[PDB]
Design a protein around this ligand. Sequence first.
Ligand code: FES
Ligand SMILES: [K+]
Ligand SMILES: [K+]
Ligand SMILES: [Mg+2]
Ligand SMILES: [Mg+2]
Ligand SMILES: [Mg+2]
Ligand SMILES: [Mg+2]
Ligand SMILES: [Mg+2]
Ligand SMILES: [Mg+2]
Ligand SMILES: [Mg+2]
Ligand SMILES: [Mg+2]
Ligand SMILES: [Zn+2]
Lengths: 38, 175, 46, 156, 222, 162, 8, 101, 82
Amino acid sequence: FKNKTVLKKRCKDCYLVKRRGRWYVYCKTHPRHKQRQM
Amino acid sequence: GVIRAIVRAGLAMPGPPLGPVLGQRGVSINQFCKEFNERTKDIKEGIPLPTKILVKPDRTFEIKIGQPTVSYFLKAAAGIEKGARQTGKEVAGLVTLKHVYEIARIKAQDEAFALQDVPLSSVVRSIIGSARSLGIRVVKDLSSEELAAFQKERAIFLAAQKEADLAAQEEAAKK
Amino acid sequence: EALAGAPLDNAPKEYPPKIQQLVQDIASLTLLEISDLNELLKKTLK
Amino acid sequence: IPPKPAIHPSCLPSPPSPPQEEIGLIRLLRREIAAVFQDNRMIAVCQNVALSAEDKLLMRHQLRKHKILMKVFPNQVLKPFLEDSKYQNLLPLFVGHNMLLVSEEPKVKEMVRILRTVPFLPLLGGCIDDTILSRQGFINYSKLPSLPLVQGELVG
Amino acid sequence: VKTLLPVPSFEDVSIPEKPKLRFIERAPLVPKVRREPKNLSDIRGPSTEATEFTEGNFAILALGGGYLHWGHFEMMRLTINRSMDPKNMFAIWRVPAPFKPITRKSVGHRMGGGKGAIDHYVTPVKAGRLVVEMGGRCEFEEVQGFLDQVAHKLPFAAKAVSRGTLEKMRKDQEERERNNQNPWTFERIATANMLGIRKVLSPYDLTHKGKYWGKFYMPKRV
Amino acid sequence: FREVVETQEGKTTIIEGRITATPKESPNPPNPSGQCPICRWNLKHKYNYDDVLLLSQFIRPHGGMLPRKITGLCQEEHRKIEECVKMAHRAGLLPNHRPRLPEGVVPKSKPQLNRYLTRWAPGSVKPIYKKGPRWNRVRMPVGSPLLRDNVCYSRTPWKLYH
Amino acid sequence: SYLPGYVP
Amino acid sequence: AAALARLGLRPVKQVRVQFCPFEKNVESTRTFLQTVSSEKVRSTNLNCSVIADVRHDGSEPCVDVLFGDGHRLIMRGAHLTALEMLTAFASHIRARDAAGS
Amino acid sequence: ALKDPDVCTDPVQLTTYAMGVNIYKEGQDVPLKPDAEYPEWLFEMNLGPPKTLEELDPESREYWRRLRKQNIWRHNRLSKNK
RNA sequence: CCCAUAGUAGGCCUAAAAGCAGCCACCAAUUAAGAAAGCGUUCAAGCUCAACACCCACUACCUAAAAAAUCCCAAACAUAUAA
Ligand code: FES
Ligand SMILES: [K+]
Ligand SMILES: [K+]
Ligand SMILES: [Mg+2]
Ligand SMILES: [Mg+2]
Ligand SMILES: [Mg+2]
Ligand SMILES: [Mg+2]
Ligand SMILES: [Mg+2]
Ligand SMILES: [Mg+2]
Ligand SMILES: [Mg+2]
Ligand SMILES: [Mg+2]
Ligand SMILES: [Zn+2]
């Protein structure tokens, strides 16, 4: 992923989800939009 | 799919802009110009005609033809050869409401307005909005006395634009 | 003031009540009266 | 230290929401709807299935050759008008995307054959000559001979 | 029938000839020679100038004290002039150009030997002052985006506001002072020197009333 | 309550919905002016994770929470019950509301650790290797801040961090 | 059979 | 329509929806017809037919789905939502498609 | 190379006949008819600028089209900066 | 969530400028849909948003992190009436 202190969606297919105690951003269309809460 | 573009009557060319479009589809480019030029033969050459091309899964085409654009009708009806560069600030041409009625009585025969089954009033109110985009002004009464005065003053304006326009070209060379 | 709902497609024909009176009234009249009515009817309908 | 009310305001009955004057467009649709049911006598309620914008304009154009209009009104404006009216039993039809096929003269036979091309377009019901009907009633009124002949049936 | 609403009309608004922000120079026209003291009380406490709107309707509000150098002015200028529509917007400066000289000694020198030489100039800012004022045929939602982007890069706590939000902000604070259920306030105690509390306070605390600590402003304090 | 069933006969599948007996609210509520079932019965600030008779009325057969537009709860109380149900499952107080296991699954034997007042999901919690100094201690959360306004009968208020 | 101040 | 169009009516042969409009339990069935009769779904398989037969016999509504394999799916919508009917409809599409191939 | 066909310039001719109307080569120009023969609604049209919102009738479709068109313009301005 | 037809490729500039390089206008068909707010095309195509219809998404718009070197660092605790 990419560790970010301020998560932000970069397209319409990005979706927020809370896992393992922290927020993530996943995207199946563009896997480079993936972010991890720091 | 469907391809729709504006094509001059009797002047279809195998090259661009329409050539490369048909190439991607794989449709025969020469057959189009053959059929089209032979179908628009009765129509005067150089008139823009909206064309809609229907493509079948076997790269077979059945062209579709429409009536000329409103811009052609309005320009011709006014004598103007070229629309205004700026609208609302200068008047390029001048036509009547009688022309607009003879232009809607023939423009309402096209696929678009016909399939809607609208009255001729709704078409005349759409052609006055396109005339404004051109700069043309729609007047109720227009006698040849004042149509020859405005037409005479329009050339004065056109001549001035050449001087200003040509002045910029000469300045560009000095740069 | 509220039109009656449509009768079911499988239900037996339920004829309207207002006409039931008309059906009976025609039987009471005499043919000569019915005939006179009819001559005016045919012309009125044309 | 912010004040704390003894009872949370949400737990208490909220005051009724202030009324709001009806929009001008609403009181315009009602005037057009009334005209529809009053002016023309044949009214067929159909379901506005998701036909393509072209296949939905081509059909509407065919319905015009025979002088059959295709009106569309919102169900929230067309339900109240029916709740207080003669046509109070047409209410259950208006659930979802619907439209009105209306004509001053009933040309049912001419509309049905146009609706048979699309098997997934259902003619739910109608109201002819202030008489409510189902679909199967439209199929019969279509097969029923013209009125002038029926006028002659008794004469004959 | 989704209910539509009227829209505000800005036809009555006029746009100046130079809507963009003018350029700010590093130093004043004539360089200063007399060196000045630090005078830190120019960024301490509430502001008594440029606290109200003059021409525009949206601005950047300062929620703390600080000094602005040239680097800050360029960031505000470029960011605003790039992100704004010159035709329907205009912006102006509510702060003067850097005038306060800041001395600095050369690297490696020990304490003493006099005072340093003028290095750069700054502009002192107090809390409650408007830094940039914007206006024109635009709503606040349009400018609020890039104005906050600018406000976040300033050396003090700032925030974009409008004639409405600013007014509401002030009225909400007055409401808090009135409905406060706590019978004990900083003002009452300090002014009466209850508990001998003025032995740990400052004379400025009689006027700031606990809402200010150095250059920092605390809006949640009543 | 509604149920759905599928019956396969002669390679043909049939799906039906059948209504079932539905429970009815008890009559004569103490506070008929209440807006949600909680204030109508004077239960606001008076329930905890261990009051399962109350919590079972707002969950599904498999342990899931019910929507707020169905139960009629207020967002403030729906969030409390949603958190008290999470802590009841973790404490083992809802053993008949377990998740549905697909055909052919036998849960493995896992260390049985008794716990209560568990705010966070066990697997998503990392150990505190560095407690920190007395003024910046890393506390262990116990309970929920959503239940902080609950009726306390003691002089010491609810401690939420150990 | 519930008074105004009854709590289950 | 979007979720059902990505899948496609490939194995399907015919779909028939019957309901009584005047009855007060046909909202689900009429909503199911609104999506299946969409240009997105119908386009996936032109051969696949979609029929709507209206009735006024006071009978319950049903959705009968004929597949190419010969299997049939029936959903009685009086006490079923459109989403439930659509979901079950999709699941069978996926199963029957895999069986054929 | 492709150009619009040449248009005549003769005041008397333009007012008498509509030049662009006829497009066929074998056909003839369309002469304008007198005023009485044209319909009645053709000389009450809006030659000038569009009617403002304050001039229209609230209970009219043309009033809400203008109001809906102004809110689409607003949605676009607000979204542009985003 | 849902859905998208048309005067028209508006005019001018331009090799080309087709809602989206720039300047001008920003009117109008249809119950309803900007002479186009965001991607995109060499230009076009093409995907969304604002529209109608359907009917309750019937939200918040007040804060976003953390790492050093001998070995973490009292032990523990949410519910019996403020002493
Ligand atoms: S507790 Fe009173 S509204 Fe939910
Ligand atoms: K800052
Ligand atoms: K362009
Ligand atoms: Mg419109
Ligand atoms: Mg257009
Ligand atoms: Mg053009
Ligand atoms: Mg353009
Ligand atoms: Mg396009
Ligand atoms: Mg472009
Ligand atoms: Mg523009
Ligand atoms: Mg939309
Ligand atoms: Zn993405």
